Symmetry: C2
Subunit: 324 residues, 2 copies
Amino acid sequence: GMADLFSTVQEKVAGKDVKIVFPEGLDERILEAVSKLAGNKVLNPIVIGNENEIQAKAKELNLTLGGVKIYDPHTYEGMEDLVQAFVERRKGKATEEQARKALLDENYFGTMLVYKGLADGLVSGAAHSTADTVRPALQIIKTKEGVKKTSGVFIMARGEEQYVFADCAINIAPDSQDLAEIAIESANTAKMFDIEPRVAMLSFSTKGSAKSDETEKVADAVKIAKEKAPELTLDGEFQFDAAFVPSVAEKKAPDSEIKGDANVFVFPSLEAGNIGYKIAQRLGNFEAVGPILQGLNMPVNDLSRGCNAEDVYNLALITAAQAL
Amino acid sequence: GMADLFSTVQEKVAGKDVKIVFPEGLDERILEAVSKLAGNKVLNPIVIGNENEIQAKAKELNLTLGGVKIYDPHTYEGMEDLVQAFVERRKGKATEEQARKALLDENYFGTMLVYKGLADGLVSGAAHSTADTVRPALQIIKTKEGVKKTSGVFIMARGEEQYVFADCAINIAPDSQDLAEIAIESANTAKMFDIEPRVAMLSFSTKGSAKSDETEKVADAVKIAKEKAPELTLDGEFQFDAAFVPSVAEKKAPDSEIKGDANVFVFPSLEAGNIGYKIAQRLGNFEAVGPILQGLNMPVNDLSRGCNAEDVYNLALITAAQAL
């Protein structure tokens, strides 16, 4: 099912020994996943925390920290090189004493590391709010070329069915500019899982039906997106019908690239997207892969507190894929 | 499936010979439905339009207009009375010449009838925009006691599962007052189909998670509703998880009337509610009964252009139930 989908990712990732930092060094979920990732030599895990503590924790979990590297912010040699890199990146917003204090935090340390090439991607979240992960990710590592914000996609899968759901996690109330972006960036993220982009900007009316600011927003959003990325197959302001079942596509809106065959759905707002993926999951019995951030300079992803020890492993595979 | 749900309604409706007006007299969907309703003596259909025409059209669909009554705005004997009743209900907003013109419109004419007791409910929409149906319904018949607006609910059903989805059709951007309303009104409508109300005001966070205007809105809504209707089992600001799966309920928000067993979900906005019932339908493979308006003084419902001849039949059953 969804598993067939990760082996695809792990295929590209395995062997290229990509470094992924896991700030939550004492978390057994992280440890178990790290211990196994290193054990099968899929990628190079870098844990963060006190070595003696981490080592002892791994032993009570009957684990071994094989090809696993450990960095402790209170011992790390490159500190001032880092502390100085941080203050410079914060363009004055940070004193030296501040940066020093800041970098003693596992998430910030781990991010400075990804930032200075000493790691290729970060993976945290199993013991921090999603903000605490995405925060530094935005102060330090920043967004790529023509991107202004990050968004969280969700790979959805049921047997052969695989879709992407646009920003059901970060941006609360996106505007025309943002939606256009989420669409384009999601289409790129969908490439990673070997899916062929076909975006459908969702709303509560199809190409005209109801006309309010809400439908304009999405509509406007489609112009901007079609304008920026002309080749991307994406038409806009579709109800889920029009976007999902072909019969309804020709009735409500023919003469449109999307012929009721969209596989990347961009929601109009966080209220619709979050409730959306969740209904698809709990009601449609679709497997759902947690929020995957996108559009950053370097891969950074957020696990859910109470995640699975195998969720850490897979987020890791997705994160290392984004870096490759 | 859904079918059992209708026999339930038809059980209460059949025999009490309720009158339902169908303004779209020349529509074959209405004619086929009206022909059958009258055929089984379920209710008393009143079609609106030219008799010779309607009669001729019934002929080419191999229909008989048995216990079906036909009213023609251009012939109706009580028209003078109706025009005056309209001007009065339009408190000066309409001239006499204007009300006369207005009442020659099948939707307005059928609404005036419902309004003066000559019919019990109206059913239109098979050939008019949803605006054209709800318009006169709001100028003429109006909202009940303490209701300020209408909202469109959807009965959802898959096998044994039956739920109600809050305003996925009328109100674009509801506020705390409206959401609170939609919740209470939807809980009542849910009674009609023999469902035991358990409202869950949805959003993108559970009791506290994220705090923005958006979560406040819904949260505020829950106070207003619990205040107004103390006995109604409804707790608020749940993500769909919290509302749908018990495991998630005790984790994210125990000490709440809703223990992951909600069966009436009130969405925070039309973008979420419309995209929501449709994902449930096309992905969850749930059967969805089109928009059912609620809270008006007299039943008025809207079919979708391109509905089923059986969709008219069932909307009629529901509309007649709302009247009883």
